[PDB]
Amino acid sequence: QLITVDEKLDITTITGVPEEHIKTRKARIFVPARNNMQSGVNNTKKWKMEFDTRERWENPLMGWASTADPLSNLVLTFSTKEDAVAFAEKNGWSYDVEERKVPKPKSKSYGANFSWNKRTRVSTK
Amino acid sequence: PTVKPPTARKFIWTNHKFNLSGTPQQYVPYSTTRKKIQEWVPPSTPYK
Amino acid sequence: TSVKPIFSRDMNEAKRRVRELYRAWYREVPNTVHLFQLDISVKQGRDKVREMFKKNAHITDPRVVDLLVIKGKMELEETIKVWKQRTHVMRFFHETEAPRPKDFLSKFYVGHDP
Amino acid sequence: GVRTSPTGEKVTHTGQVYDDGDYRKVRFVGRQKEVNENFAIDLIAEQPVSQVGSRVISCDGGGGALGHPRVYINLDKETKTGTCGYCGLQFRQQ
Amino acid sequence: GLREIRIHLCQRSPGSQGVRDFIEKRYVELKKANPDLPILIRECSDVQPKLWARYAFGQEKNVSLNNFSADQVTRALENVLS
Amino acid sequence: SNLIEVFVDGQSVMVEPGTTVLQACEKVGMQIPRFCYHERLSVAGNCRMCLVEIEKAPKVVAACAMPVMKGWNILTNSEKTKKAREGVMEFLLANHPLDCPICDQGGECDLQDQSMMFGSDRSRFLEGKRAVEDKNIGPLVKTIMTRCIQCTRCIRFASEIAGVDDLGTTGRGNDMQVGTYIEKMFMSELSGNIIDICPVGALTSKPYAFTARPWETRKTESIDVMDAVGSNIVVSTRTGEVMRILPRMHEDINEEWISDKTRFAYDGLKRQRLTEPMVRNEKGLLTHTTWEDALSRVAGMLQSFQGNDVAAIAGGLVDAEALIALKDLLNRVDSDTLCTEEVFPTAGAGTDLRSNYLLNTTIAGVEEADVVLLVGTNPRFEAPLFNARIRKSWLHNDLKVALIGSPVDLTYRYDHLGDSPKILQDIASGSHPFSQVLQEAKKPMVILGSSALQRNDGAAILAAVSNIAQKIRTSSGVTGDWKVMNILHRIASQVAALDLGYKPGVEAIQKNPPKMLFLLGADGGCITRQDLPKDCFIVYQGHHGDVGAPIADVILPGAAYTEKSATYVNTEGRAQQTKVAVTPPGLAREDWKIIRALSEIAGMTLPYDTLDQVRNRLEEVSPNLVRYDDVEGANYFQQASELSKLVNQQLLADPLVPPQLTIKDFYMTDSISRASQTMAKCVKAVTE
Amino acid sequence: RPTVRPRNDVAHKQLSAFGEYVAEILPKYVQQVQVSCFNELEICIHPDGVIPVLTFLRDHSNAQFKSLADLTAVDIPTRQNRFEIVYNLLSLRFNSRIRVKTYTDELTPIESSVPVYKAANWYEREIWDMFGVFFANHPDLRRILTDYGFEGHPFRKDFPLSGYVELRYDDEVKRVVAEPVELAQEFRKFDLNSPWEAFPAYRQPP
Amino acid sequence: HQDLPLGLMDDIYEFSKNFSLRIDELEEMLTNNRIWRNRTVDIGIVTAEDALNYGFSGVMLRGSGIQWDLRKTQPYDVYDQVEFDVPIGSRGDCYDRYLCRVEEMRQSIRIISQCLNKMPPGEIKVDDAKVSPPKRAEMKTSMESLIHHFKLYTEGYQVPPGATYTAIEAPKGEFGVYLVSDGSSRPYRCKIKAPGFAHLAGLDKMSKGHMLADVVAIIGTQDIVFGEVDR
């Protein structure tokens, strides 16, 4: 037999996360931009959730990059924007969603390279 | 090495050193890179 | 909004378990202070129990409350059976942590964190 | 090519040296600063330029498979030598 | 003393039609009357229209203008200016 | 209706006619391998990596160039397709140098990655390799041309996007070489983009060389503040250090390009930094102190002065959150002298109506216009990515472009109407022949540069240009919803300052000199101590020691744009926000937090304690400032035009000369780029 | 073909036939049955079916999966029920292995399978400890791997690799203390995924 | 990773030649010793039925008479090509499990003998450079080899999406991995099945009705290493 629960789902008190890393963090929900150095698009398929960047300082002994932020490396993957937003909401994280950027469909024509009267005519091949 | 001597290179230590830990010749680590961020030096005159 | 319950079918049933667990923790504190030879008083121990209970006072989901009681009982069993050591009990009090700034100015002086 | 700063601390081949008011040089008090004395930049500059006949030469660093990946160097420019991008050996077309 | 007036409204919502009508007809006259009073008009989609008045030492009040008429807007400004 | 049906591996797809095979595959989510093809360049069809089999066709077709026919079944994974890819990859790698460990492309290389995915795993090439000499093309782009695969992307980009026909191929066959032939420098404001489009490590960033590998960098998606375009960027960091700046695709702003100042000036963030609060000592010299001491000193003055005795000037790189915080603080001493260095005429409506100071047509709207009139501006250097959008329309839409002002070079041929501002009156009257061009235009565009408004007769010019836009609308040539009047800004912070109610220009300060002056990143030298009373108390808050800091009494080290989450509004009114990539150096602090901390110490505590709360405040003052990535759109041009006809200002006789005439003026324009050693090398290169 | 793993169609056919067999007998619980290209049979079931399905597979004469090889969980945050419970069973009689999978979320308990396999006792304690999945009617459910008083469930995808606290000995209080974690060298996150698709056969529809 | 160095197989033969004598010396000390038998015989008895339900494997099953060995029933690599016998217990106690382990050592020598004689020639890693890195000489000469070496040591090979439970007859019992691939070069999930985990969970069952000193014997007969138990 089932019960009825109309509460908004919230699990902040049973995740073990310190309050500082629930209430002062800002989660960012986005589809990563394509690395402009490459033409492949396979890394722009899934939604991601990262947290606000925090201080890094130089270790006095070695000069290594030290941190006190336990979420500095936390990156989560989601199939849809709704899945990511739902996950942030039940975990109590304040979040920002940025709409997916889709390359606009283009009109390509190899023949335009040799136009009789238009500026699209190329001067070299 | 009396029959198969090692190849000679000009940079190989001519004098072997044993473990120097706990002596004044012990290794001490440090960062080998230079300063990253250069600070602004205020003018040395009271033109203000 | 139809879900499988854990233990309690509503908040009233859940709150009964919360009170039963508080009773058990309340009575355990004097034994814990003696068994672990803690330097804290019984009043400090019982105040700590109240603070931990109070921080979850805002929950309205009976399933979440069940889990909190399930975990609270597990914590009590660790303490009573002396599976914990002195360090584990004293971790509730953060004695070696320096107080962290609360107001805007204090935080502003010490770093970039909000 | 080691050199000592005005405070007497040697400069490494990467140019590192604690400046005057840097407390971190306290770590060397009673001990020493490990500095390699065989500066590679100076050692590779002592190698003579190799005179070759062809426009294109290949270098693998010597020793066959014990060297570096084999690359080919264009020697058309007469204002400069062709330098191996792995080992720094220089070549010139004669 | 009054220091600044801000009017917020939506470009398309019916609730801002009265504010839109006011700016169409009355705003130029208003600006001529009060040449040195900054009247910041700021349109944003899907906002309920509002009138903000800023007084000396950063004291501010806001009045809703949702579903107002052009005259009700005119009276709301008349109240603020005086 | 017009769509035709094709199949990709038996899956039906409806495409418009003219769609290439490569584009049809994209519709089902299959990316055909490519090297020479770039969706923003003209089709080349020379690398052959995109060869694909069409069912029942003996010959594989170049998917990038071949238009798809009705009923075709594209076999993207057949044995014939796979063998074509392996063969082409085999040929690409035959002469390619074994450079991966020393080559900066390694780890983000399309040749490496498509070799792994679509090529064989071994070599059967038993000959010697080709080797070509390198070419010097400037201080920004290093060329290792033995790595070049002759894809001609750089050639096509330089000719089409940048409008510079300096790159080509010399020789023939296996000896064909990409370059300039003669010794020449490719120094264009968009030149650094050839690093991104070169699929290999043949073209690489000289400043970046050898410093990092792609897999170890952290990517912060952020916004550029070097101009008012608001180009979307990615900031690459490693271990708390900024390593480079990359473009981030945004179709409606910068596409996938950035200017060279945006790309290479980031090294200015490592020099001349303000890291500690400073105050004057007994000798009149700046000396380091604590935040407590410096803020207490400033607070004591803020509590002693009131009204017109306190003023602020906002610089060009300031953020909206700091702008509202400083306005709120000064309002709490009943001061309304909140100024900006950049001037915008206050005659008529002034900043009452957003449409009076926005690029109302939008950057993407240039692609729809049929005529563009540029008045007193050099958009090539003021807004490089906006000028590239004009050339894109000039190229593909046959856009007609006319200019009034100095006959600068815009990378496209334009009609020079002269440089006298009196031409604007001739056009408005109807005597000038160009007026007929505007009248016959269905979607005309008039762009007045913010640089031209820095003249004394700026209000006269704005009225004249706005008068031309009035006549065009009165005639029915225009479509109504289409907007004609545009202001092109060059300062990142200007539009946000105008939205919040700042007074544009320092005229009010010159009219009423203050006893206490706040320089919020103000480094334009607009107000010196010669324009101020003898004992003026100057507080400089910023991130660079440049022009403002040396003359200040107190220095409050602020954060740079890579070191804060801050709001900037671009020339079209779109609000965008940066993200923190690295924390501010030393004791520096977030700018809005400094003002909030100052307000509390002075007993005038501001009512917001977090970034979100100060952004809630921004909404109260201008709701558009929190609608990130949206272009709201402003109206009431008629009302603004009706008010600009009241006071009749006279047009000066000086010809319209933009501040930047040649490339040498482009590289250094703000504190960050002035502190950049790369920008100094570019300036040296284009002058010697 | 020396470098390619050979197929075994006979076992693929046998496992497929037995997969239908199980689905026909337990339609109340079975949601999906699949056989991997390397011949592994998975029965995806509704969580109510854990005890009936496991009991059937243990005791049925054509099944006899007497040995519980492994019981574990997988966290997939993008799923409404983020936790996938995986039972790996072995049948010595028929020299075969089967996998049974169900799901749950943070607040929905799963029936303990200790009555079917005594082996499940500790496996379920570990799943509770590492993922926070509660098993109903478990004889002795409590942490097993983590330290006493440990907060959180470390194997959840959203739990940080280095956690939130770390230990040291403090001379002033003369005991080991727990403090917020600070690292002399932050763990360096690497972005390794190539931007080019590797396996067309698994491409998802756009 | 690498081929055997020249001369190694000869040395493995010399070692194997003498090892059974070492086992015999061990059996001389323990097998017939009445003190050893008093410490192990009828200690920690587990029935065949219980051993299966409690998740036991390896010698913990064969000591109770269950005829099961993954090298025989689910062979991997070339175990189907070597001859050996599986020792089976009869009493299910510590002494029988000890005898099973001693006899398994003898069978391991028997298998090693066949391996030394049947070792074939050829390459020692799969000749697919998208999975296994090329030879160093190739990497330093061929463009394709250098790329694949670069990518295998930075990104690593991508694994097709899927999940597998793979087990072997490890010396302590069935050792398996439930490995989940999400298509990338890093595993999504890797659950490790340690045979000692289920064996130790059965310590309470096996120790019932025994004395304190027997608990030490029962822990030993399970052969517990806490690296695999705790992971």
Add this chain to the structure above:
Amino acid sequence: PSGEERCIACKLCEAVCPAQAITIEAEPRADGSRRTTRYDIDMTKCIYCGFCQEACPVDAIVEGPNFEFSTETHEELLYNKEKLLNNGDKWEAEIAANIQADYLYR
């Protein structure tokens, strides 16, 4: 053999290191060479697996034959580039012969 460093700061060793024990920074050397300015190995993070020397394309980083380098302090086991270059100059005679003995198996 000329004395030039073999390492050209490709960072393959740093990428493959299973323990993240290697830290590298690099820039163009004054003569234009691609060389490291930082090369650290935390010998208390290292698992002595040899993946770095497998990954290295130019035989620059190796694991030598020395195993008797225990120290009295933790800090002495955080090797920087100078220490590692000194190790190379100290042990090259043995290292080179060992590589000569095994390189045909690699």
